């Protein structure tokens, strides 16, 4: 089974960067619909699977990738945001970032470009290519999970669905992006990075 | 070459159904951005085409379909809404709805279903299948336009990107649907229908 | 579990239309790889599913749609071909076909156009739209199952992957199509049609 | 405007590796069809563009990417093969293969993996990621060309459509791969590499 995880701050710990109304509707509304559906779908799956009904397995795929990723994506997200965040990573993460993107500002520009360029709903991500042994930026449509659809370990995800920023920044997705840099939990991404060189 | 059309009613003319703040951002900001980027992409496409540079013709395609579609879809969208709309059609459009849907309500239910089911940004459509002589419900992803991607002649469209109802209905896409039913310009859907049956 | 079904004719019952070498390599080579993989994948699925590992469920989707459809598509195919086939359907099927496509020749042209137009690997199909209550033609990429990915009941499938005709007709896919009309099992498709109005 | 290039060796010059019958059909028939349909699509694209007819620009895209890509991919393909090829590269190309793959063989194994794994018609690529300064393996579906769809500069390509090995290797895509390794024109891959590092 799956459960909506608790936010490790409250709906306002992120003001003024991401306002309270968004952090509430986002977590308790969207993310919550994902997990119910994930569960409902996984169960409908178990059945189609037992009867070896391939038509069913196939028909349930989209709902399971959308809701599955909906759940994983947002769960990683919540951990990536922290009221005492922002700044620059420190330690190895920064060095890898220096190594892979040239500097932290270039890294910043690139991930902003990637998130700003997804047409429609999607996510911008910094991931770890365990195969090549280096950081990579990817962008995914709708709720497509990063690792699943790509094999990259998600380290940092930026939700660019309009519901992630509409009530506050409106159509101005680059502003929402300027903001999010102040509430990024570098401690956690360093963590997520650390477990990749494990 | 492409120009943002003008709305045939003022921004608040569809209240309480779609609040004027949505109407003002959607037309002036969103639809505006498409037209503009559309004009810029075609410009780039012509250079790429003039040199038979298949690489750049290929790279510019997403942008072209996205923005061109964005422009087409919304232009039809404003024409499908009217302050003096709502109700049901009559004459042939209705004869046809029954033929193919059984009843206006069943129709009414399928189009809502198709629109509510869009995963992420997209659109629900009532289209006309010319080859078939039939009316047809179809959903499209992002700004992929109906006719160009499906061959169906567009009759009525319902934008389901979050930007089209989030400031009002929040996550409740379903409430947005129940409401838009009241501002449907049946004078226009019927006009669109009368043209294929020529 | 899944098993490669027996062909209900032998690798030559279809000469000269589809030669023996093709009917053998196709059935015992391709179709056989599908079912092994289907099984292997379905099992790997059951596991990812129990541990609620969404990354895994997601990563195994493509192999399960490809191999699942690989198996269903080809199984339907074998039944659609018969040494004492060809001709025109008779009974209701023909009337529905007369109703939906205007005549049998138009139907023939359309399904030939659809199969001839799939870019890369794919299938051309005549299916039943149980919702609308009429015959519809669709085309699917690679091994995408018809019913699963579309909801249409498969009545008649024409495999247009190059392995379906290369050793015999070479790049000449329309010739392979002219041929297949002589070995079509109208008895079976009428059957498949019959169970749809059930 | 587009012309089928000429092969830089005779059709049987790559035996016993790729039989001359494959070479003659692939260049004269397959590649020929792309170029031709490419010239016809661009022609149609220019009319559609000249009228800002977004609908037709949208409808012609598959055809354009397909045929344009088909032309691009194959043209590079003939240059990547030579009767006096085989072996391993040397100089910087090899330095780089090691840097990024560890060893020529590991490289050799990943590209085969990527090529053998293509579901349906497609291509395996060894490309150059300029932004990164790295060599990169990438697979593409149908005729989607590397650079136009991925941004990677194409270095070596291995066609995995069935038409490229079926008359010889039949279903055994893997045997086709083991064989093509012997006709790789490393003089050309190196030339392609030397251009990005400019
Ligand atoms: Mn979200
Ligand atoms: Mn809109
Ligand atoms: Mn087959
Ligand atoms: Mn080829």
Short mmCIF file of C-alpha atoms in Angstrom, two decimals, chain D residues 49-165:
data_model
loop_
_atom_site.label_atom_id
_atom_site.label_comp_id
_atom_site.label_asym_id
_atom_site.label_seq_id
_atom_site.Cartn_x
_atom_site.Cartn_y
_atom_site.Cartn_z
CA UNK D 49 4.10 27.89 -44.65
CA UNK D 50 3.59 30.69 -47.21
CA UNK D 51 -0.07 30.86 -46.19
CA UNK D 52 0.62 30.47 -42.47
CA UNK D 53 -1.64 27.39 -42.68
CA UNK D 54 -0.77 25.90 -39.28
CA UNK D 55 -3.03 23.00 -39.98
CA UNK D 56 -1.14 21.74 -42.96
CA UNK D 57 2.22 22.57 -41.40
CA UNK D 58 1.14 20.28 -38.59
CA UNK D 59 -0.21 17.46 -40.77
CA UNK D 60 2.99 17.26 -42.88
CA UNK D 61 5.37 16.97 -39.93
CA UNK D 62 5.48 13.11 -39.59
CA UNK D 63 6.23 12.80 -43.24
CA UNK D 64 8.93 15.46 -43.00
CA UNK D 65 10.70 14.05 -39.96
CA UNK D 66 10.36 10.55 -41.29
CA UNK D 67 11.64 11.11 -44.80
CA UNK D 68 14.08 13.87 -43.96
CA UNK D 69 15.45 11.70 -41.20
CA UNK D 70 15.41 8.66 -43.42
CA UNK D 71 17.58 10.55 -45.87
CA UNK D 72 20.00 11.97 -43.16
CA UNK D 73 20.43 8.73 -41.24
CA UNK D 74 21.22 6.60 -44.26
CA UNK D 75 23.60 9.10 -45.86
CA UNK D 76 25.68 9.04 -42.62
CA UNK D 77 25.21 5.25 -42.55
CA UNK D 78 26.89 4.64 -45.91
CA UNK D 79 29.83 6.79 -44.77
CA UNK D 80 30.23 4.75 -41.57
CA UNK D 81 30.91 1.56 -43.52
CA UNK D 82 33.95 0.62 -45.59
CA UNK D 83 35.35 -2.53 -47.24
CA UNK D 84 38.65 -1.67 -45.53
CA UNK D 85 37.29 -1.02 -42.06
CA UNK D 86 36.95 -3.10 -38.96
CA UNK D 87 39.44 -3.09 -36.14
CA UNK D 88 39.43 -0.34 -33.55
CA UNK D 89 39.97 3.39 -33.90
CA UNK D 90 43.10 5.12 -32.59
CA UNK D 91 44.24 8.61 -31.71
CA UNK D 92 41.72 10.82 -29.94
CA UNK D 93 38.53 8.94 -30.90
CA UNK D 94 39.93 5.96 -29.02
CA UNK D 95 41.32 8.03 -26.16
CA UNK D 96 37.75 9.32 -25.79
CA UNK D 97 36.06 5.97 -26.11
CA UNK D 98 38.12 4.78 -23.13
CA UNK D 99 37.51 8.01 -21.12
CA UNK D 100 33.78 7.66 -21.52
CA UNK D 101 33.26 3.94 -21.92
CA UNK D 102 36.29 2.69 -20.14
CA UNK D 103 37.28 0.42 -23.02
CA UNK D 104 36.57 0.00 -26.70
CA UNK D 105 34.90 -3.28 -25.88
CA UNK D 106 32.63 -1.87 -23.19
CA UNK D 107 31.71 0.77 -25.73
CA UNK D 108 31.34 -1.95 -28.28
CA UNK D 109 28.96 -3.71 -25.88
CA UNK D 110 26.75 -0.72 -24.99
CA UNK D 111 26.17 0.34 -28.60
CA UNK D 112 25.20 -3.25 -29.44
CA UNK D 113 22.94 -3.29 -26.45
CA UNK D 114 21.28 -0.05 -27.46
CA UNK D 115 20.90 -1.32 -31.00
CA UNK D 116 19.66 -4.70 -30.16
CA UNK D 117 17.15 -3.26 -27.73
CA UNK D 118 15.31 -1.03 -30.21
CA UNK D 119 11.67 -2.04 -30.14
CA UNK D 120 10.62 -2.17 -33.79
CA UNK D 121 12.30 -0.03 -36.45
CA UNK D 122 14.96 2.34 -35.24
CA UNK D 123 18.68 3.06 -34.89
CA UNK D 124 21.52 2.82 -32.35
CA UNK D 125 23.94 5.77 -32.30
CA UNK D 126 27.31 6.76 -31.02
CA UNK D 127 26.96 10.53 -30.75
CA UNK D 128 28.85 13.50 -29.38
CA UNK D 129 27.33 15.61 -26.68
CA UNK D 130 28.90 19.00 -27.39
CA UNK D 131 27.47 20.83 -24.39
CA UNK D 132 29.05 18.03 -22.33
CA UNK D 133 32.26 17.35 -24.26
CA UNK D 134 31.33 13.64 -24.04
CA UNK D 135 30.59 10.74 -26.40
CA UNK D 136 27.11 9.35 -25.92
CA UNK D 137 25.14 6.22 -26.99
CA UNK D 138 21.55 6.97 -28.09
CA UNK D 139 18.79 5.04 -29.78
CA UNK D 140 16.23 6.63 -32.09
CA UNK D 141 12.79 5.34 -33.24
CA UNK D 142 11.89 4.93 -36.96
CA UNK D 143 13.85 7.53 -38.89
CA UNK D 144 13.96 10.21 -36.17
CA UNK D 145 17.41 11.65 -36.74
CA UNK D 146 19.84 11.99 -33.88
CA UNK D 147 20.80 15.68 -33.85
CA UNK D 148 17.41 17.07 -34.82
CA UNK D 149 15.60 15.13 -32.06
CA UNK D 150 18.30 14.85 -29.41
CA UNK D 151 20.84 17.56 -30.12
CA UNK D 152 23.64 14.96 -30.25
CA UNK D 153 26.14 15.33 -33.16
CA UNK D 154 26.05 11.89 -35.02
CA UNK D 155 29.32 9.95 -35.19
CA UNK D 156 28.44 6.30 -36.02
CA UNK D 157 25.04 4.83 -36.76
CA UNK D 158 23.66 1.33 -36.93
CA UNK D 159 20.32 0.88 -38.72
CA UNK D 160 18.26 -1.77 -36.98
CA UNK D 161 15.16 -1.72 -39.13
CA UNK D 162 14.52 -5.29 -40.28
CA UNK D 163 15.15 -4.19 -43.85
CA UNK D 164 18.81 -3.82 -42.99
CA UNK D 165 19.57 -7.45 -42.19
#
